[PDB]
Nucleic acid binder design. Structure first.
Ligand SMILES: [Mg+2]
Ligand SMILES: [Mg+2]
Ligand SMILES: [Mg+2]
Ligand SMILES: [Mg+2]
Ligand SMILES: [Mg+2]
Ligand SMILES: [Mg+2]
Ligand SMILES: [Mg+2]
Ligand SMILES: [Mg+2]
Lengths: 39, 216, 225, 109, 4
RNA sequence: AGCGUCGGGCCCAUACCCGGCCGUCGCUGGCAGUCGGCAGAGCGAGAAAGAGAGUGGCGCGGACGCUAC
RNA sequence: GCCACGCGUCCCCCGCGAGCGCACGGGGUCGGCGGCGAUGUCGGCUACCCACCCGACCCGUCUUGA
RNA sequence: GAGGGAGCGAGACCCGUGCGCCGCGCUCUCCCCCCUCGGGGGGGCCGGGCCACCCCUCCCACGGCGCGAC
């Protein structure tokens, strides 16, 4: 795919970092939910 | 002159770096790193001296030759291959050695070797089964592990140790290896109740028992 | 001598190396600029809506420039007025596909053969899948595979069409040089539909597959590819 | 020291109404009646056994009369626990309604 | 030459 | 296991797809370049054309090949 | 986060650096293995007979139609 | 799992080697530091725009409202 269209490195390099960061936020919201009911 | 450093950019996925080449020019620090710009042998004789040749052309040629072959690229050999392993099989787990003349027996795993074949030992005392190799593909993983972490089993044993030659007599060294691993493990298996009975016992199917259906 | 010639031959290869690199960097920059383009195109069509509803009116979007046609039935016993049209659209085999720019002239023919085809308005991903996976150019009257850009530059360099991406751009934006871009493409040999078909004979509205099924063509492509 | 294989019956070949493509074979395994269930057996080595008049070799032993045709469970067939299987040589129709020993030892676990 |  | 309205799932044709093989047609395609101590082994590449003359400033070596009906 | 990095000169405003490895890369390889055997055993498509499963109306001809 | 002579290099001061085109990119030819047990693994090494937060307001597009003009 790169031999034909090389920009795919950046297009598939992003959309990974994005997802990991957003996964961190999902977990942070769950722990803060436990903090809100407990506190 | 410089010792070889590791790859600077980490691996996220096979063949894709984490960082971009523009941050990389910096990290490598290219801003301050620009550049610009036998066959004949002499020998003595008891005459003169003879200048002999090495690697002389062959005295006979054959009647016809096969041609050259093309360069394929990705085909590494077996020694150099990477060796996989299932999640179930960790050292300690109990295996069902299904196929060989030692059929359906229950036996403890020690270690994957370089080749990828499994080191297995159905305690010779109990099962009458020595240190034997097997293959993963022909083996069931039970969920009944034990904490085998603390023994310093010898390094010397290996694939070439188990490799066939071409009568078989049992070596004293073989007897030592068996005895040496036994003295270490046997109390842990005799500590847990009924388990030595289970090990002496052999696995075997019977009526109304279907592998897909049941679970273990 | 074979001294000065060696050094000269090295300069010639070095020049052609730098040239190939430069074409590579150029290619990259066209593609990133088109990503920015597509993103903009998609957002604005919503923004027009939100603001329209705020005022209380209705936003009517533009008519679709492009349609993706598929022949669903076979070669036996077909009216000759049809056959002529069909072979003008290059639909000689069953489960063959073609792109078609729209206008009164084309749409009246597709009306005349409604029962034999299934068409609609295809999405961008479907265009990628089709071109990339099954791209085969008509080069010197020969069905040759679209595996390197050289094969394109030789033929279409005169329209500044150097790569798969520019091709895509023209297709989705039905630009100037559609005729040449499509006539370059060999009729798409699509396979039989995974999952199945509802009923070959009848129109969509009476529960069939023929005729205009605007967007559901994408679902059908995913089942056929 | 016991039964180390699941039972299956050779129901018939792959076939339409008036044509049978006998290079493929249909198994009906005992106690399995759903496509969920047949995902276990995938990949497994089947083995049709038979016995013949004259004495033949036997690997690891003296020559027996028994012989074998090895095979392989290809993929599921149908919705009610039937299953396709492709044997290395094509099967005889005599065997219709008989036993085949599906083994276990290409495990998928 | 600028690379130099 | 009938009648009417419908869902998922599922079955196979010498039809469709991917791959192997035979023959024919088309490209009026390519190949006489096996140019060897008179040698230096390329001319598939996005862009009309030249690996062009000159003149001032030790060891003796290198596979197949082409009945051109 | 960036396929952004001599100096001098030009514009708008403030033609030769070499070196070494990895591989989803112009069509599969192992530099990996195991069993049987000199008088009853191995291979032997075709061709000899028998069995089973499915398929299957006797040829030539005139004929719109066998 | 069809196919089977792709050549790399060194150059008329040599005569080799058969991992070679296209394509992705690691280290050394800079210098320091850090961690797990000489080997293995890390942090990096300085300049410049851009967008990131907050204060100001220019050009075009489209929509709405108001005053005014034809
Ligand atoms: Mg299906
Ligand atoms: Mg019948
Ligand atoms: Mg028996
Ligand atoms: Mg068929
Ligand atoms: Mg084909
Ligand atoms: Mg007659
Ligand atoms: Mg007649
Ligand atoms: Mg008559």
């Amino acid at each position: 795919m790169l031999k034909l269209n090389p920009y795919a490195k950046t297009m598939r390099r992003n959309t990974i970092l994005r997802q990991a960061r957003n996964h961190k936020l999902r977990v942070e919201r769950a722990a803060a939910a436990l903090a809100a009911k407990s506190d | 002159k410089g010792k070889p450093h590791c790859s600077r950019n980490p691996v996220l996925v096979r063949g894709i770096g984490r960082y971009s080449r523009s941050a990389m020019y910096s990290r490598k620090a290219l801003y301050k790193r620009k550049y610009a710009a036998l066959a004949t042998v002499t020998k003595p004789v008891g005459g003169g001296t003879r200048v002999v040749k090495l690697r002389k052309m062959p005295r006979y040629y054959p009647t016809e030759d096969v041609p050259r072959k093309l360069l394929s690229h990705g085909k590494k050999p077996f020694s150099q291959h990477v060796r996989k392993l299932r999640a179930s099989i960790t050292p300690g787990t109990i295996l069902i050695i299904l196929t060989g003349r030692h059929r359906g027996k229950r036996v403890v795993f020690l270690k994957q070797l370089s080749s990828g074949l499994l080191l297995v030992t159905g305690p010779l005392s109990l099962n009458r089964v020595p240190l034997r190799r097997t293959h993963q593909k022909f083996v069931i993983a039970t969920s009944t592990k034990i904490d085998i972490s603390g023994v310093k089993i010898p390094k010397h044993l290996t694939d070439a140790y188990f490799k066939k030659k071409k009568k078989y007599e049992i070596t004293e060294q073989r007897k030592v290896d068996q005895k040496a691993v036994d003295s270490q493990i046997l109390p842990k298996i005799k500590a847990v109740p009924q388990l030595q009975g289970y090990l002496r016992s052999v696995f075997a199917l019977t009526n109304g028992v279907y592998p897909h259906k049941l679970v273990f | 001598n074979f001294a000065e010639l060696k050094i000269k031959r090295l300069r010639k290869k070095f020049a052609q190396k730098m040239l190939r690199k430069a074409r590579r960097k150029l290619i990259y920059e066209k593609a990133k600029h088109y990503h920015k383009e597509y993103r903009q195109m998609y957002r604005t069509e919503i923004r027009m809506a939100r603001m329209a509803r705020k005022a209380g009116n209705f936003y009517v979007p533009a008519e679709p420039k492009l349609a993706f046609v598929i022949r669903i039935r076979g070669i036996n016993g077909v009216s000759p007025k049809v056959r002529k049209v069909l072979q003008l659209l290059r639909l000689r085999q069953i489960f063959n596909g073609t792109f078609v720019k729209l206008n009164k002239a084309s749409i009246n023919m597709l009306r005349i053969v409604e029962p034999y085809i299934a068409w609609g308005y295809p999405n961008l991903k479907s265009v990628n899948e089709l071109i990339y996976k099954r791209g085969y150019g008509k080069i010197n009257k020969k069905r040759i595979a679209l595996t390197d850009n050289t094969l394109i530059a030789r033929s279409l360099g005169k329209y500044n069409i150097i790569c798969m991406e520019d091709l895509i751009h023209e297709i989705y934006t039905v630009g100037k040089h559609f005729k040449e871009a499509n006539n370059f493409l060999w009729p798409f040999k699509l396979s039989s539909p995974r999952g199945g078909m509802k009923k070959k004979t009848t129109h969509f509205v009476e529960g069939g597959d023929a005729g205009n099924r605007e967007d559901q063509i994408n679902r059908l492509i995913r089942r056929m590819n | 020291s016991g039964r180390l294989w699941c039972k299956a019956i050779f129901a018939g070949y792959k076939r339409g109404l008036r044509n049978q493509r006998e290079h493929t074979a249909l198994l009906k395994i005992e106690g399995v009646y759903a496509r969920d269930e047949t995902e276990f057996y995938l990949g497994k080595r089947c083995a049709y056994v038979y016995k013949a008049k004259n004495n033949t070799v036997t690997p690891g032993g003296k020559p027996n009369k028994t012989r074998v045709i090895w095979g392989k469970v290809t993929r599921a067939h149908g919705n009610s626990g039937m299953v396709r299987a492709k044997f290395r040589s094509n099967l005889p129709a005599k065997a219709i309604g008989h036993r085949i020993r599906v083994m276990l030892y290409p495990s998928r676990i | 030459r600028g690379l130099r």
